[PDB]
Write a structure and sequence with these properties.
The chain is an all-alpha fold. The chain is built from 13 helices and no strands. The chain has one domain: TRAP transporter T-component (Serine Threonine Protein Phosphatase 5, Tetratricopeptide repeat), CATH 1.25.40. It is about 70% helix and about 0% strand. Palmitic acid (PLM) binds next to helix 7, helix 8 and helix 9. This is Lipoprotein. It comes from Enhygromyxa salina.
Length: about 280
């Protein structure tokens, strides 16, 4: 019927626009709106929870929901860094859809949370089908919490760690050495008294580069939260310049848009250092 075929076409429209995300924020926002349409949402500019009744968290939708989580994160991380309110709004949207991506991909997880099993323990049971969900949920949750402040961040630390621990168990190479890149940031951002460890950070960051030397986002995160922490101006400067100098064809085609964002982030950090007299 009209809506089951309008959801099949909007899924097609969503995927098409997400593949064209290198064109700019518009295509990203077009992808999100089509997915949300296919997920039964009324259209609009407010939080999903105000427009999306009973999103279908079924196995056949799990891939879509984890991709929606990544895409809303991509929008905020790429385009809202200058706008704290919007950035916080949209990272929380990605968290919201990420919770539904986890439920859809993992019946055991959905069952566990209904028997009052706490996330910390439930997340450890998610199978390979849920790795995209749990990785992009943790990415959105971490960046949302970080922007909110220390109280929110430390409140989420143990659930984040359990999530990334499970992702690393399932596949340390997922999304270009993602679980290792994530832990590099985790151990650099956390203060020592909250579990921070520069040795574990560098170890994880290096393992990520060994698995995916082309992933420029690893070096951006190193410069941003480690080189600053280590008060190593030379390394901060070097990492960012290596990012900016990297050739486009060094990374796989399917993440060219992400790498372009990371080069923009490096230029932005270069100008922040000058402006705020870092180092
Ligand atoms: C002090 C409390 C603990 C601190 C918790 C730190 C969590 C930070 C989240 C890091 C986000 C990195 C996401 C990388 C995504 C990608 O692969 O592009």
């Amino acid at each position: 019927g009209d809506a089951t075929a309008t959801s099949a076409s909007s899924l097609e429209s969503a995927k098409a626009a997400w593949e064209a995300r290198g064109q700019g924020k518009d295509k990203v926002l077009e992808a999100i709106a089509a997915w949300e349409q296919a997920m039964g949402c009324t259209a609009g500019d407010t939080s999903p929870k105000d427009r999306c009744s009973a999103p279908p968290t079924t196995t056949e939708n799990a891939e879509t929901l984890a991709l929606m989580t990544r895409a809303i994160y991509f929008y905020a991380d790429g385009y809202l860094r200058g706008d704290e309110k919007a950035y916080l709004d949209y990272m929380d949207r990605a968290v919201w859809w990420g919770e539904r991506a986890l439920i859809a991909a993992s019946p055991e997880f959905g069952e566990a949370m209904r028997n009052k099993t706490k996330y910390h323990e439930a997340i450890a049971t998610v199978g390979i089908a849920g790795l995209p969900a749990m990785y992009w949920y943790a990415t959105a949750l971490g960046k949302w919490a970080r922007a909110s402040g220390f109280g929110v961040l430390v409140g989420q630390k143990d659930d984040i760690k359990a999530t990334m621990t499970r992702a690393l168990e399932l596949d340390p190479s997922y999304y270009h050495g993602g679980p290792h890149r994530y832990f590099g940031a985790f151990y650099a951002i956390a203060p020592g008294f909250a579990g921070g460890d520069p040795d574990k950070s560098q170890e994880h960051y290096q393992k990520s580069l060994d698995l995916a030397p082309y992933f420029l986002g690893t070096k951006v995160l190193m410069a941003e939260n480690l080189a600053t922490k280590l008060d190593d101006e030379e390394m901060f400067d070097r990492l960012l310049q290596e990012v900016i100098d990297a050739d486009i064809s060094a990374a796989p085609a399917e993440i060219h848009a992400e790498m372009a964002i990371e080069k923009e982030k490096a230029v932005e950090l270069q100008k922040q250092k000058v402006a705020e007299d870092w180092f």
